[PDB]
Amino acid sequence: EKRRDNRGRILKTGESQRKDGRYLYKYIDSFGEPQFVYSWKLVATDRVPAGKRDCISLREKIAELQKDIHD
């Protein structure tokens, strides 16, 4: 019924998983134009596979992009 990634994590609206595994979310900027963010992590407690560097989880990014792009 509810959606999950190739792992079993329940991702929320907008969030989506690619065949490569990197997650993807979409948000609106201060100009009203559509943007997209990428990350090999869903939460800040995840861990990227060797070869990939650290990255900011989406949840933490979403709060920063909506809050930092807007005033």
Contact 18, 24 (CB under 8 A): yes
What method was applied to determine this entry? NMR
d(C-alpha 25, C-alpha 42), whole Å? 10
Distance of CA 26 to the CA centre of its chain: 8
Domain extents in the chain: 1-71
Q: Specify the residue for token string 């979403």.
A: 62
Q: Strands (DSSP E) along 2-71, which ranges?
A: 16-17, 23-28, 34-39
- The partner residues of 23 in beta bridges, in order of sequence, read 17, 39
Q: Which CATH superfamily is domain 1-71 in?
A: Classic Zinc Finger (3.30.160.60)
**What residues contact 11, with CB distance under 8 A and at least 6 apart?**
3, 4, 5, 17, 23, 42
Pairing outcome for strands 23-28 and 16-17: antiparallel
d(C-alpha 62, C-alpha 20), whole Å? 21
DSSP SS3 for 29: coil
Contact 11, 57 (CB under 8 A): no
Distance of CA 11 to the CA centre of its chain: 9
